């Protein structure tokens, strides 16, 4: 899985892209990304569009040999896509809104099929 | 197995009935009699213990735990061989402290032959079956006395408290671990006229204190206290005690009143709140010719801070602009109802109007009502709500209920208002308090006729009872300016201190319904403040005064219910699926307990199914009763004649078949009928029907508790 | 202690399994006659299609020519609360009449008089159902029907956060073991009164089914007489012999 914060920088996990013991390092061509999908066998065009990555960035504190300490990657999208019903952006909170909201715990919407 | 050895020695001390440490009032002392009281001493009986100021005539407060030994040593120094009779189990007849015809060996009386000047050690202990270790308080008190002559072994001061607590959370002395205080109480009537020295001194001395000269209990805040409900009287005498403001927790149940007899083995504990000067209202109608008053002095010592949250935890608020309007009006109200049903000729054609040329028609009976706006002239309707009469209407409290009693007197005497056991604000009074400090924390309830005053305070989550008891607790309110005279003038009602079932702005009573109360207060016109509006001012027969005669006396002595002295206009004919909450009350000039027998009908209380019940004055008794019966019977009592021959009830209870609403007249619905559209029990809402609360459009914070976590 | 024992292959007809056209069930029904099948309303509303087969003791397997009771269309109910649960009773309008066989036994119609004599005597009951109310991790292939006792009404409004009315009450054990969401939704909680059998309960999910060892929710069809009477005589005589018998009715069940 992955995520999306806007329309350029795309972030994802780091345990599915870099693995020296597995001997498989991708470049900037074999890393695709699909946004907006409700199945797997079906394939349309009027509701979604296949994206393409070209930029990759590593993490400074990439000490995954201990107990996986912050394994989050970040790429960059160059295709000027739009935002409709099947493509919805999302902002991000800050600090001036949850200065004392420790007694909470709002969960998110982690969708997906049988991939894990 | 702990050794709790004590050294008690009884002696005669000329203790005055008033604590006067200054020798200025000893020449004209109004009290100077001897008292043979219990006094603790050091081992081998050397020096006398100083004793607390609260224990005027009370002996040493013995304390023990479970499975421990108590080798108490006694040394009588009075004049007659006294003894000590506890309430243990392991003690035998050889060391029991009871001198009577035991029909056994004469050597068993060695525990009673304690000559004045002879030492004797009692070898006692306690078994393991004296510890609750459950929902009861960690202590089980007991009372030890002398079995010689109860008339003398009490009025002289031969009374002492015995404590058998639980081994574990108790310290050495009777104080718990989490509680830092140990308050021992005693309320007695030392009848000096019947004792050893036969002297005419029939005076109600609570622990040897008259006119409220008992030393005041004082303790600063930010700590925990523990109570000990003790105090034996001369016999069938009771004490209607109450803890104003601060609410205790007897038997792990948040209560504020306790009135039994013969010193019932019961202790309690609580947690103090803000600083102030609370009241210990020892309002005993049958015991007031001498004097018995007390208060609470709460200071402030910053030691520990609890996690007590002010408002509810992020779900319940219901901030509404609903202030109860109360205007002390003088509307024409009489003992007989407006157009009586059973024809109350004893009051209709004698005192209701100009008949018999007695009082008249225009009266000044003040009643506490509840308006709907800022008018002070008409409530929800022009007359009353019928179902209450002169009694207070329906008032419910919740979180941020905004109990702003906009009281505006307009009669002829300054009145006020006071709910039973409610903590207010330092700015507004609404309680008979003597706390007169600075302008910031001043509280005055004196509301002159014509002036208006609003008692503003926010009832929150720290003002709700427990969880195991009923939903809304019954707490009858009354005027705090006067004590006994305002109750007779019709200035009494009832308050619903409910739990945490605040659904909306009014609080939907889940698993409940309506309310049916029952009041029986016997008062007199001479007891009320408006005695002048009877035979002297409001009078038209100056030649013949209706006084000094039994006819006019019993004409005022009447028992009222819902403002209706003869019979009420409503009946107790309920039906099925009626999860109502029956309330009972019977105030007046009495002090003992009052009962009422039910023939053919019963109730549900205490996870059982009893027939009759017994209420208590001062406080209010509440019970959730489901009225399921078919037929009609009487509900008479068994007493003498003025309270057993006319205290009946005529009603018909019928349910054909479910709630009986297919061919009769009742404010219910099973429904069980043809429902082709919308009827009863049809909760179909477009967004969401119901669940627990309505904090948001779906309630996203998940922490709905029932008090402080 | 009598645990979760399966239903017998003799006196256990009341089990009209409501499935779909594919290999996926949803709930069940109740056999009483040949023109009405009592079941929950959420069986069809906010769900999928409807396929009924009476005398079907197993879903994965088949005991021969016995499971046949197709349904054409279906309607809803007036008092059926979409969000919560109240009078959750729906009638399945079959399309083909089925005679009385061994696994298909009829039952006499209830009446309002059996409301004050059946709840005070028979303090127990059985819950027939394949196991589709709690379709989490107990999907048994065999038709299970455990025994559950009856509890006082004052302990049923607090079993679930939803306030329950008179139509539904307690019908399970105390807060000890799993005694709720037993069987398929719309499952018959028939109580053997006296020489006859009258159903008096429909198991439905309130807020779903999780850690519900407190009490159960089961309806009472004795008060539902005015609905089974308005949907049987106002529809008229069977035109094409149970078409629809008769599904051509208004949504609030007439």
Curated annotation (Swiss-Prot), chain A:
Coiled coil: none annotated. Changing residue 34 to C: In FA2D; Quick-1. The active site is at residues 15, 71. It comes from the Eukaryota. Glycans are attached at residue 25. This is Thrombin heavy chain. It comes from Homo sapiens.
From Swiss-Prot, chain B:
Changing residue 506 to Q: In THPH2; factor V Leiden; risk factor for Budd-Chiari syndrome; risk factor for ischemic stroke. Glycans are attached at residues 23, 27, 211, 269, 354, 432, 440, 526. Coiled coil: none annotated. The modification Phosphothreonine is found at residue 612. The modification Sulfotyrosine is found at residues 665, 696, 698. Residues 2-301, 320-656 form the F5/8 type A domain. The record marks 306-307, 506-507, 679-680 as: Cleavage. Disulfide bonds join 139-165, 220-301, 472-498, 575-656. Ca(2+) binds at residues 111-112. Residues 2-165, 175-301, 320-498, 508-656 form the Plastocyanin-like domain. This is Coagulation factor V heavy chain.
From Swiss-Prot, chain C:
Disulfide bonds join 7-12, 27-43, 156-170, 181-209. The gene is F10. This is Activated factor Xa heavy chain. Changing residue 140 to P: In FA10D; Marseille; decreased cleavage by factor IXa; normal catalytic efficiency for prothrombin. The active site is at 42 (charge relay system), 88 (charge relay system), 185 (charge relay system). Changing residue 172 to S: In FA10D; almost complete loss of activity. Residues 1-233 form the Peptidase S1 domain. Changing residue 156 to F: In FA10D; Padua 4. Coiled coil: none annotated. Changing residue 132 to C: In FA10D; San Antonio.
